[PDB]
Design a protein around this ligand. Structure first.
Ligand SMILES: CCOc1ccc(Br)c([C@@H](CN)OB2O[C@@H]3[C@H](O2)[C@@H](COP(=O)(O)O)O[C@H]3n2cnc3c(N)ncnc32)c1
Length: 192
């Protein structure tokens, strides 16, 4: 895999990914609810026109985040074993591949004590992210041709699309190219 940095649009969030080849399809970030950077990244107010599904019914991001943290504490092993929930922080990070802003969420599907405690979400190609994006109304972008992203996440090998300098490469070739690019920029590393 790889670790990669996403810059705050307004602080770097380090993610661990086994699919760095899919970087151009990362449409949002997810931090564990406990992640140390959450309180720092929480906006004072919601953006105008925010999707109500993203706000946990909280009047401000800080109120919604406290409510989410309190609510998920009422979950038992049963719930944690078994739907995608979560909350928008009101803030954005920059995707280092395409320079596009992506919204930052917390969600309990991301575990605090594993990897870096944060992920890049690629709904096109990770079913967990696909499910979350469908529930929240987040963009789902195909970057690996081979499947049908309107049906389910496509998790297999294929050919890079919608990925600029990666276009036409296989998954293994694209992983090497993007790690090379991350290293040249000082923004990522290959990691076991
Ligand atoms: C396993 C298939 O994963 C993927 C499959 C397809 C795609 Br496209 C991707 C991309 C976009 N999501 O990145 B994937 O998700 C991250 C990381 O790589 C992967 C690390 O899991 P492995 O340590 O067991 O190998 O799990 C996710 N992960 C990393 N840290 C995590 C954490 N703390 N909590 C929950 N999930 C985490 C991943």
């Amino acid at each position: 895999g790889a670790v990669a940095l996403f810059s705050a649009r307004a602080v770097d969030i380090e993610v661990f990914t086994t699919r760095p080849d899919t970087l151009f399809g990362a449409t949002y970030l997810v931090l564990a609810p406990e992640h140390d950077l959450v309180d720092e990244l929480v906006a004072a107010s919601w953006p105008a026109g925010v999707n109500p599904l993203w706000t946990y019914g909280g009047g401000t991001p800080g109120e919604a985040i406290a409510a989410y943290r309190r609510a998920i504490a009422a979950k038992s092993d049963l719930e944690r074993q078994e739907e995608k929930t979560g909350v928008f922080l009101g803030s954005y990070a920059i995707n280092p591949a395409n320079g596009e802003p992506v919204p930052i969420f917390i969600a309990d599907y991301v575990l605090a004590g594993y990897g870096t405690g944060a992920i890049m979400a690629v709904p096109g190609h990770d079913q967990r992210d696909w499910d979350f994006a469908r529930a929240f109304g987040l963009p789902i972008v195909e970057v690996i041709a081979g499947g049908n992203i309107s049906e389910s996440a496509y998790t297999g090998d294929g050919i890079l699309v919608n990925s600029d300098y990666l276009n036409g490469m296989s998954v293994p070739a694209a992983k090497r190219a993007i790690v090379d690019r991350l290293e040249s920029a000082g923004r990522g590393r290959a990691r076991i």
